[PDB]
Amino acid sequence: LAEKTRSIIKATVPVLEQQGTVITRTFYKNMLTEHTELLNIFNRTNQKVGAQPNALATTVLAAAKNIDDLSVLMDHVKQIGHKHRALQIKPEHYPIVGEYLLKAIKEVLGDAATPEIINAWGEAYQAIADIFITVEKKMYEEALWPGWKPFEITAKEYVASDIVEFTVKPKFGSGIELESLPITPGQYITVNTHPIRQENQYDALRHYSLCSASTKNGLRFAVKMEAARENFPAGLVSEYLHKDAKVGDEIKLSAPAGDFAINKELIHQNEVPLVLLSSGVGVTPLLAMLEEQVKCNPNRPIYWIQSSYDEKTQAFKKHVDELLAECANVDKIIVHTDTEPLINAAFLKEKSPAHADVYTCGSLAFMQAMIGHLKELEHRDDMIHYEPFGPKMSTVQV
Ligand SMILES: Cc1cc2nc3c(=O)[nH]c(=O)nc-3n(C[C@H](O)[C@H](O)[C@H](O)COP(=O)(O)OP(=O)(O)OC[C@H]3O[C@@H](n4cnc5c(N)ncnc54)[C@H](O)[C@@H]3O)c2cc1C
Ligand code: HEM
Numbered sequence: 001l002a003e004k005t006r007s008i009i010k011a012t013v014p015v016l017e018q019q020g021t022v023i024t025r026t027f028y029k030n031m032l033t034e035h036t037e038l039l040n041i042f043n044r045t046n047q048k049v050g051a052q053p054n055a056l057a058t059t060v061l062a063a064a065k066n067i068d069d070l071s072v073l074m075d076h077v078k079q080i081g082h083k084h085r086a087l088q089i090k091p092e093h094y095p096i097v098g099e100y101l102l103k104a105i106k107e108v109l110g111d112a113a114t115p116e117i118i119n120a121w122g123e124a125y126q127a128i129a130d131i132f133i134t135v136e137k138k139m140y141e142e143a144l145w146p147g148w149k150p151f152e153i154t155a156k157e158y159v160a161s162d163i164v165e166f167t168v169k170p171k172f173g174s175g176i177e178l179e180s181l182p183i184t185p186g187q188y189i190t191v192n193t194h195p196i197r198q199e200n201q202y203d204a205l206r207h208y209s210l211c212s213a214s215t216k217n218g219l220r221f222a223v224k225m226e227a228a229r230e231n232f233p234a235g236l237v238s239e240y241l242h243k244d245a246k247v248g249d250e251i252k253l254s255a256p257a258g259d260f261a262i263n264k265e266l267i268h269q270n271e272v273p274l275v276l277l278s279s280g281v282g283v284t285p286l287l288a289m290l291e292e293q294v295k296c297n298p299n300r301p302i303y304w305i306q307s308s309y310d311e312k313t314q315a316f317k318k319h320v321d322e323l324l325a326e327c328a329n330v331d332k333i334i335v336h337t338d339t340e341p342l343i344n345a346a347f348l349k350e351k352s353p354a355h356a357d358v359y360t361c362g363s364l365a366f367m368q369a370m371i372g373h374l375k376e377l378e379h380r381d382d383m384i385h386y387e388p389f390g391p392k393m394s395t396v397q398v
């Protein structure tokens with residue numbers, strides 16, 4: 001809607017494409033300096049030293065390039081919406097983001113941002129914001145339970161030298177029944193914690209993938225310890241969960257979220273193989289999926305490709321071997337990067353079939369590298385699914 005508006009928006013594509021991240025960095029710095037209450041929601045680390053500014057810049061760019069038809073973006077809007085919904089973002093949060101976005105645009109564009117250009121962006125923001133609010137309302141409706149609910153930590157077990165699997169059960173009166181919780185392998189939960197070390201003053205929200213779609217004996221997720229290396233601090237919430245949150249303590253969770261999921265129609269057939277490709281703690285939702293595959297159809301050709309620094313840091317070794325031993329047609333491919341090369345294109349060409357249903361998960365950089373290889377091996381987009389442990393929109397070409 002609005003024809004002169006849409007040309008104005010399009011005329012800013014070049015600045016967003018080349019300077020978009022100057023805009024988004026200014027945005028975060030101003031909004032969070034001026035509005036420290038949002039530090040209870042935004043992950044300081046992703047913006048100051050992570051890829052959050054690139055995720056936003058790419059999304060704003062995609063919206064500007066598709067201003068005539070925003071429906072093109074719906075898969076990205078749903079992906080982001082699942083995170084917003086898990087984080088408890090509501091309609092009444094949207095106007096402040098719009099204020100600060102328009103202000104960052106004005107600041108960066110300078111004399112190249114007249115009132116008409118700003119007005120148009122206000123209009124574009126309203127239309128884009130209305131879409132997200134709508135998707136998210138649906139997600140609030142479908143959520144398995146409402147808002148943050150209290151769980152008790154019932155177990156904490158090392159699944160590698162530096163990865164701890166948490167088992168959580170809902171506190172009685174949370175209205176949550178473990179036997180009546182349909183999980184799709186690939187989903188993550190979100191914790192709302194308030195770490196006490198490092199002079200922390202804010203809540204800290206983090207996503208952790210579910211290790212299993214079985215819930216009867218509690219929900220399970222695994223946290224890698226982001227330890228302190230001379231200079232930079234230990235990861236705030238991973239440290240808090242490893243060292244401070246004991247068995248018996250309460251932790252707050254919002255309901256399972258996310259669009260990462262194994263293709264349900266391909267589970268039960270044998271012609272199309274499954275490739276599960278992980279790095280480090282990225283293994284966690286892939287274990288969930290391997291579990292589902294093996295329980296539903298153990299005859300499917302499966303390729304388990306798992307990279308880690310070394311054997312002690314390789315997570316779920318016994319678990320994975322036991323699941324794999326049940327499969328009649330499996331290749332297990334383990335990489336240890338302390339000695340062995342980082343998985344490259346030739347490795348993938350040699351160790352996995354040309355036409356496969358591929359699910360890959362790990363750090364944003366590992367995802368960027370692996371997608372680049374899978375595209376270079378001519379895999380079709382619709383057979384590559386991935387979940388970066390960070391902002392997915394920083395991994396997408398717009
Ligand atoms: C969909 C999704 C699923 C995820 N699933 C999992 C999972 O299953 N398991 C898991 O362990 N994680 C998972 N994550 C990542 C997880 O949510 C957290 O981001 C992770 O635990 C790190 O959080 P933290 O608070 O411990 O570290 P943060 O305090 O946010 O710090 C993050 C990293 O930055 C470093 N750092 C801090 N300050 C600086 C600085 N000044 N300069 C340079 N570096 C710095 C820290 O040491 C740490 O390594 C997932 C993320 C997403 C988006
Ligand atoms: C139309 C408006 C909005 C857009 C276009 C947008 C866009 C995005 C994008 C691209 C991401 C990163 C997700 C990913 O790449 O995986 C994100 C995450 C996030 N968004 Fe929004 N968002 C909007 C509204 C809001 C509002 C109103 C708030 C709250 C005030 C909010 C809070 C957050 C938070 C807390 C995260 C997680 C940040 C992190 O993980 O570091 N968003 N959003």
Ligand SMILES: O=N[O-]
Pocket residue numbers: 056097
């Ligand atoms: O970065 N605003 O989601």
Ligand SMILES: [K+]
Pocket residue numbers: 034035036037
């Ligand atoms: K404020």
